[PDB]
Design a protein around this nucleic acid. Sequence first.
RNA 1: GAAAGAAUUAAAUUAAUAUAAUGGUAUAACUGUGCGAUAAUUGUAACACAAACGAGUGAAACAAGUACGUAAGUAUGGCA
RNA 2: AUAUAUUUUAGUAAUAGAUAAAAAUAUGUACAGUAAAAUUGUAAGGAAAACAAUAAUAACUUUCUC
Lengths: 348, 113, 274, 64, 113, 66, 120
Amino acid sequence: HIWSDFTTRPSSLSIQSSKVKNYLFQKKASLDPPSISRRSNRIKYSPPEHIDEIFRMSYDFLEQRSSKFYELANKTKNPLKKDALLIKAEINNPEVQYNFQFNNKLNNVKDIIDYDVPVYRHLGKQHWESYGQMLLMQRLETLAAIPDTLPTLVPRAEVNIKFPFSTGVNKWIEPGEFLSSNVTSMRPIFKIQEYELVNVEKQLYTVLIVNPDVPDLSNDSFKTALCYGLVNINLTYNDNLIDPRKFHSSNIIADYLPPVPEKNAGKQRFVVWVFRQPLIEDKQGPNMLEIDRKELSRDDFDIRQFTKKYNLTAIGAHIWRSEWDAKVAAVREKYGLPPGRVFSRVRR
Amino acid sequence: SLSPLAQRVVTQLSVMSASRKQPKLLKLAREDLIKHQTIEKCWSIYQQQQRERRNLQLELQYKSIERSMNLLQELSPRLFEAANASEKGKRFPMEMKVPTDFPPNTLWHYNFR
Amino acid sequence: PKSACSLVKPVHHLVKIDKSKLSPRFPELKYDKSDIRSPGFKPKDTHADRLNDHYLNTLQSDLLLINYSHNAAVVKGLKQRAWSGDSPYHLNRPPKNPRGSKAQLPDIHPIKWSNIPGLESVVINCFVREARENQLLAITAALQLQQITGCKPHPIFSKNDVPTWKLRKGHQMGAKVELKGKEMSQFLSTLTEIVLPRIREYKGISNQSGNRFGGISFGLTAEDIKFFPEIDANQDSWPKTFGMHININTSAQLDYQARTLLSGFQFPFFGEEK
Amino acid sequence: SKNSVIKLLSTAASGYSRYISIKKGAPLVTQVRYDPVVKRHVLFKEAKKRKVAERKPLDFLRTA
Amino acid sequence: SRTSMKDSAGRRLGPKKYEGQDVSTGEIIMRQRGTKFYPGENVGIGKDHSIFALEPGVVRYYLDPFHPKRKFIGVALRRDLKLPSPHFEPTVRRFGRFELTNKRAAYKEENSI
Amino acid sequence: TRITLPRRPAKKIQLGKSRPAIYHQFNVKMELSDGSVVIRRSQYPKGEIRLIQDQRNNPLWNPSRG
Amino acid sequence: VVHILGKGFKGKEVIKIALASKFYGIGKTTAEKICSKLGFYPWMRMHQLSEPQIMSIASELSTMTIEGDARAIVKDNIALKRKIGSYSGMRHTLHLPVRGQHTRNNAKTARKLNKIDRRG
RNA sequence: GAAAGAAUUAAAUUAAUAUAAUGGUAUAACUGUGCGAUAAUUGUAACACAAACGAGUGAAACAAGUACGUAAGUAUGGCA
RNA sequence: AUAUAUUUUAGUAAUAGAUAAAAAUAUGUACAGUAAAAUUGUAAGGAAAACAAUAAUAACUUUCUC
């Protein structure tokens, strides 16, 4: 009985609720489900017949399978293979399924869904692939944030942004949203959730918010603008919210300048990109990198060139898009930016 | 309004139709839903295993046949030729019946023709 | 509409966007029909299928043994022939259609452990021709079919028009039902045991019957349908019984293999084979 | 003479009319379009009172 | 005797703006009856499948690797460019506006929602 | 001339809400010509049937054996 | 009265002869004692039959030879000589006095029914 | 080794498309479908195409509102 | 068992599928799929009802498994 053992196995694989666990594992269908909170509703409810004995048999079967997998898993040396074996062992565990399905994945509590555990991480990845990743990809393609900034994306990390400091309200930004200048007045907060097996201690990350749609009237086209640039950020599967708490002033290659779209300049895409650092062998600890702060410019910014220079690989992305409103002038004034231009309504 | 034949047709139609004959939807609790999922997944896995076992057995049989026929070809050409014939109109014998739920009164016939 | 020009734009990523999942319109429809949470849920594997079990145990190995031909290579079918490039008019020319046929024919593979012939699907086509006069006859035929099978029939409509036979276009006329898996197996077992023996001068299924590739068929008269136990139960409610065609579809490469398979399930075969 | 022209008047008392063409038995038409005068969409009912072929009410409820 | 003396004045329907040519937003690059030529980069296709100018540039009839067995007629925003544009790259884009440098002009545009 | 049942307005089955037709079926025991019993699911209400003319007493299906 | 032996009958109808009527393989004396073995009080009508009883009724007819099953036996006895050199076969095949009756005149009857599968 | 999926190539525009004939069509215009039934809306239309004129044809865009779509969006009647 | 009230049922009717080349609406939008012909067939069935079958699997992923 491998799934009842918790000597070597993490605590997160068990259900933390006692009542739920008891309901799952009983000898007869006597008890009533903890999910149904209301007595009258519990009374009304009737579970399907014979479900218990069969369930128990299924558990035994899959428990045996897990145990067999574990016999292989411990003998394995290479890490990715071992992780895969662990996943195979525990993915069919009812308790872990309960934990994952019916508790929040975004702000996961460590005791319930631990992303340090490989199985839970795999589940989270699968969940991301099912909806959120696809949506992100659609928003990147439709809005034309991929070819315009950075050729392609192979989504690996799930990136979610927030604007907590400006207004007060709590809301994770859906990709391709129209945010007010009040909302995006102060800086955002990232959460880079990584689902691949990666060296947590060594692996650093960079985050770049880029505005491809600021108008350049000499060229009669647009230019990029690095609105916010962080480097050498340390992520951990559970500890992953990039906040002023975590990153230091040394990490900020270009400190947050807010979206201030001009009147009739149009809708401006702000597409955050998340890259992971190149990992160097034969060097213990996190390998930093120095950025030439005079070389990179904010008013015009070759993202692709920058990536080429520092050998980055874009793992994640997110995007919002701002256009002119009444408060952009106020935002500019607060930041000490100039009055802000006004263009002709007609694109002649 | 309607004839007796028309009425009977309507009744017949109703027998087939889902109009006011079907129950409520099968709702489950989350724990119950999980239990169901675990039952189904395990079953599916078991079925796959069984399929592989049978498939493997069939492959093994095929390999054995191949091994036999090569040997036959090597040794006795006439015997090999006899073995490897077109069995186009081969018919299973009508005595090899599909096994019933419960057996008959006379289990086995000792005399024939 | 400013234009009718259809032109799908290329993309800049290899992620496969399932558009259905991004909507919030059909939340019940996002679940698979196999899943318990879907309203489309049905218990599939309710009991042990008997004919299928028999096939698995006894027949499949026997069939494999029968079909072994030593060092048998693939027989390619009739395909679209390319032009020899002996003229510059061959350069963007469509390929010559197949030799005998207009449509391409499939390759016949050697039978191994993977591709042993087995039952794939049964279809019970009942087109009642008196229903050109009476629509109610189509309904009765559909009911009969349902009774026989335990499966939901689908209505057949008159696809064509013709004056000689008093037939309009778009008129409900009989019904069909594709049986698959366990219900189909049951239906076959009933046919073998109950119904076909009660047909008086029944020699069997013809050996000249069938597709070129793994499909065999036959038909039952209105006299033959009264032997089904569900109709037998209330023959009173089945005065005007209707005949039916029975298309058996196998996983057989060729038709003789399919015939052999059916024989394994106690179907008699009488005529001179092709 | 198989088609004619009616005079879809605007619910809002504006006078705006959107003359459209209809078959002889025109299911009393009612279209929701823009009333420039009142700067908003609004329903347009027929003006002169014509006629509709006896159209049977649909039997949504089972009867007789 | 009935005389088939009737026919229709042919429709001027061909390229109307040729290669390397300099168009302007909204010009007819090719009347056609049929999508013989499909709208391509920076061009628009009208009701009759007529192809028109969206950006002021240079018309370039070019095939396309993505869409095979088809032919486009686009309008790069500049001659130096080759309209069978790469793909995985930035897309040329044109801003098209003159910043109201007039105080009054800018004020009116801004003050007015 | 053509005898018909005239259709009422059809009931809108919404997408996702369509449910599979699970007909009411009884487990029915068929005893064949000889004493071999076989269970089959059947829509008609009869728990037991015994058959007179079957494959198990037809000469075509077993050549060797008012 | 019900679907007895398929083509059944009606109530009020005393069974004894009723069988002689619908059934072709049985009639008169045969139908008489057919009830006798099944022991049903004579002068008894169909409506009174206790369904289970009909069951016996059915089996009984299976025992002896009934229905068009015998129609054929004669059909063959006819075809027999007919297939051999048999005046009858001509008389029967041509539709003429098989009983050597009035071919010259009263023979329409023969022409009406006498034929290869006579009993039609 | 097997299943299952995702599909990919070939073939096809001979089917079909409200209707002639041609042109186009599977990247589908064609077909099924949900919703809806609104853009088979309302002011300025540049600019071309065609063109003697009167007329006609495409139509960027600005503005007001409607509809469907997660969204990109699309819609100022219909493949032309 | 059975009687009175009270109600509830039974007005018996098709599509159960994002359906897909039978007939139904031909403008919008959104999602999804591919046709016809021909040949081997098959109760009546036939030149002409309906129905079934009629190209290729490299690679890729997932699952089981020796």
